[PDB]
Design a protein around this ligand. Structure first.
Ligand SMILES: C[S@@+](CC[C@H](N)C(=O)[O-])C[C@H]1O[C@@H](n2cnc3c(N)ncnc32)[C@H](O)[C@@H]1O
Length: 245
């Protein structure tokens, strides 16, 4: 496991979390590198740690730095099995790099959380934030969430050092979804179909798929006929879904 040893990254994460509101849930709390600074924000906090012995040591540490018996709940649990509340909350965590996509899927399908502040592999955070264009997974979640790349974090900021660098990713739940959550599976299937479809450019790709789109549709929606699926915006994907509905 790669613990966050760079205090500047801790400061940066706390700064982003401090601009949000509501209870906080932390994934992979470890020894409390983020837990202790987050507890000083005076908001309700749940710290999740799968290592029971480490979780018990963290519960003593959080209780010691807390005002007293008359707050932070340390839970010894696998986050993949932790029930997220349906009420508004903020999620934060330094993710184990091998469980990143499973944790991301668990969160994206989950309720209540309005902002997620996540530390993960740099290449994943980059693709998730659509740096250089969107990947299929980002476009598949774009009607319900917005992704931001807050910063790059070197492997030297962790102890022990991972084999790759890291990226600090922010995710925000849209208050007004671009596509209804009930149409998620059809929407995500359409996005898969456009990204893996044959053809060079959107005009060629949309011609070769089941239930085609009017010839005037691409240019009427501001999309150049030569553009690639990664160049479409969230609004354009939603307009395409509404068209091929
Ligand atoms: C990469 S670490 C970061 C630890 C700490 N927050 C830090 O920044 O120093 C992930 C932590 O999650 C714990 N862990 C691994 N899988 C977990 C899971 N599925 N649910 C909750 N904790 C997990 C590990 O024991 C480890 O302490």
């Amino acid at each position: 496991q790669n613990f966050l040893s760079d205090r500047r990254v801790i400061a940066d994460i706390v700064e982003i979390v401090s601009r949000t509101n509501g209870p906080i849930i932390e994934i992979g709390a470890g020894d409390g590198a983020l837990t202790i600074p987050l507890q000083r924000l005076a908001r309700p906090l749940t710290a999740v740690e799968v290592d029971a012995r480490r979780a018990r040591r963290l519960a003593q540490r959080t209780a010691r730095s807390a005002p007293g018996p008359a707050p932070t709940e340390v839970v010894a649990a696998d986050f993949l099995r932790y029930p997220l509340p349906r009420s508004p909350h903020v999620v934060v965590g330094n993710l184990p790099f091998h469980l990143t996509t499973a944790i991301l899927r668990r969160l994206l399908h989950g309720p209540g959380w309005t902002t997620a502040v996540l530390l993960m592999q740099w290449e994943v955070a980059r693709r998730r934030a659509a740096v250089g264009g969107a990947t299929m997974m980002t476009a598949q979640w774009w009607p319900w969430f917005e992704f931001g790349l807050a910063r790059k974090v070197s492997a030297a900021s962790f102890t022990p050092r991972p084999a790759v660098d890291a990226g600090l990713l922010t995710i925000t739940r849209r208050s007004r979804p671009l596509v209804d959550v009930a149409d998620r599976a059809r929407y995500q299937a359409l996005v898969h179909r456009v990204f893996t479809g044959r053809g060079h450019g959107m005009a060629q790709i949309l011609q070769r798929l089941p239930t085609p789109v009017p010839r005037t549709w691409l240019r009427a929606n501001g999309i150049a006929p030569n553009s690639l699926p990664r160049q479409l915006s969230a609004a354009q994907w939603a307009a395409l879904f509404e068209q091929t509905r």
